[PDB]
Amino acid sequence: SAFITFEGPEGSGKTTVINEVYHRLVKDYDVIMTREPGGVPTGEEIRKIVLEDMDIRTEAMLFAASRREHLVLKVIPALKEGKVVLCDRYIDSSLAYQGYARGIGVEEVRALNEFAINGLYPDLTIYLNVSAEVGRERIIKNSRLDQEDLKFHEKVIEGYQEIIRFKSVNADQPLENVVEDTYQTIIKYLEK
**Which residues of the shown chain bind a second copy in the complex (CB under 8 A)?**
42, 45-46, 49, 54-55, 57-58, 60-62, 64-65, 68-69, 72, 108, 111-112, 114-116, 118
Work out what residue 118 binds among Cl ion, a second copy, none; the CB cut-off runs from 5 to 8 Å by kind: a second copy
Q: Which of residues 22-41 bind Cl ion (CB under 5 A)?
A: 34-35, 38
**Nearer to a second copy (CB atom), residue 14 or residue 67:** 67
Q: Which of residues 48-77 bind Cl ion (CB under 5 A)?
A: 76-77
> Segment contacting Cl ion (CB under 5 A): 49-57, 59-67, 106-114, 162-170?
162-170
Neighbours of 67 (CB within 10 A): 25
In terms of Cβ atoms closer than 10 Å to its own Cβ (0-12, 13-18, 19+), residue 27 is exposed
Work out what residue 174 binds among Cl ion, a second copy, none; the CB cut-off runs from 5 to 8 Å by kind: Cl ion
Q: What distances in angstroms separate CA 54 from CA 62, 98, 103, 128, one per listed residue?
A: 11, 13, 15, 30
Helix axes 56-70, 41-51, angle to 10 degrees: 160
Which helix (H) or strand (E) is 11 found in, with range? none
At 131, which amino acid appears? S
**Nearer to a second copy (CB atom), residue 72 or residue 164:** 72
Tally of CA atoms within 13 A in the half-sphere of 191 that contains its CB: 8
Work out what residue 38 binds among a second copy, Cl ion, none; the CB cut-off runs from 5 to 8 Å by kind: Cl ion
Work out what residue 163 binds among Cl ion, a second copy, none; the CB cut-off runs from 5 to 8 Å by kind: none
Instruction: Please report the beta strands in the chain, taking only residues with DSSP state E, as ranges in sequence order.
Output: 2-7, 31-34, 84-88, 124-129, 166-170
Residues that bind Cl ion (CB under 5 A): 34-35, 38, 76-77, 129, 168, 170, 174-175
